[PDB]
């Protein structure tokens, strides 16, 4: 049995976990931040101009994590550490 | 057993994890953004015209994640990295 | 700044809870607590024992339209 096969299977499972967690986090965080933004705009129609500043920060902090995970996921499947 | 068997089993499990995470994130984020939109429209019926602008953004930032996962899931299942 | 009926801060206790108003606070209508106290800070802070008042924050102005004894003590600092 090829050890590289086992290592690749493990890497694929790890990458799947990475991307699943990243997707959950990004989706729920974006939903929560957008809920805040939508409620704020509903109460103050003219407030959007300023509410987009913190909102983009929140998304910036959320998507960041996501896209870091994605990066590491690419480091799992395409260049697998420990793969001989 | 052929190495391709183990690699493909791992790829399928990873794709399943990716889809599960993406669906959780998309569903919950869209539900939260909705909740916000419905509450806003209930409070200010006329606000709907503007409320759909930020809402879509949120949904976008959610759906993107999901759909991005989708792409990688295909990359896992149809062209498995590390396949022998 | 904001026009209190000029100040920098308006601390008050409403039925919901302690509330502080700054110059661009959102429009608001609230009921001051039965023993409410108002502290208006301007460029010393003025302390008022307000009983059964109503707070009304607008785009520009903030209008403050045993319980009375407690309000008096809180205004004069004994709490």
């Amino acid at each position: 049995l090829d050890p590289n096969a086992i290592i690749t299977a493990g890497a694929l499972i790890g990458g799947g976990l990475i991307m699943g967690g990243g997707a959950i986090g990004a989706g729920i965080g974006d939903g929560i931040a957008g809920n805040a933004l939508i409620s704020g705009i509903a109460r103050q129609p003219e407030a959007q101009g300023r509410l987009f500043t913190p909102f983009f920060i929140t998304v910036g902090l959320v998507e960041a994590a996501y896209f870091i995970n994605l990066a590491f996921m690419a480091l799992f499947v395409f260049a697998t550490p420990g793969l001989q | 057993l052929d190495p391709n068997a183990i690699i493909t089993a791992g790829a399928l499990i990873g794709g399943g994890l990716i889809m599960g995470g993406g669906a959780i994130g998309a569903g919950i984020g869209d539900g939260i953004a909705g909740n916000a939109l419905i509450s806003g429209i209930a409070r200010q019926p006329e606000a709907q015209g503007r409320l759909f602008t930020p809402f879509f953004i949120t949904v976008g930032l959610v759906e993107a994640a999901y759909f991005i996962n989708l792409a990688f899931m295909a990359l896992f299942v149809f062209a498995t990295p590390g396949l022998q | 700044d904001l026009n209190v009926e000029p100040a920098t801060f308006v601390f008050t206790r409403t039925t919901a809870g302690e509330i502080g108003i700054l110059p661009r606070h959102i429009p608001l209508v609230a009921q001051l607590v039965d023993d409410a106290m108002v502290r208006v800070e301007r460029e010393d802070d003025l302390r008022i024992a307000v009983d059964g008042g109503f707070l009304s924050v607008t785009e520009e102005t903030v209008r403050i339209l045993a319980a009375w004894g407690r309000a008096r003590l809180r205004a004069l600092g004994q709490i």
Binding site: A42, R43, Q44, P45, E46 | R43, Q44 | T14, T15, A16, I19, I26, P27, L28, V29, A30, Q31, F54, S56, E59, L65
Partner: peptide
């Protein structure tokens, strides 16, 4: 004030939306 409460409250007592610390109905009552 009372007009603002009535506009955004149920009339059943026997641009920017005003925020009401408790519900609008209780403020309307008092």
């Amino acid at each position: 004030m009372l007009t603002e409460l009535a506009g955004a409250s149920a009339l059943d007592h026997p641009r920017t939306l005003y925020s009401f610390e408790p519900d609008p109905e209780t403020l309307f009552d008092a």
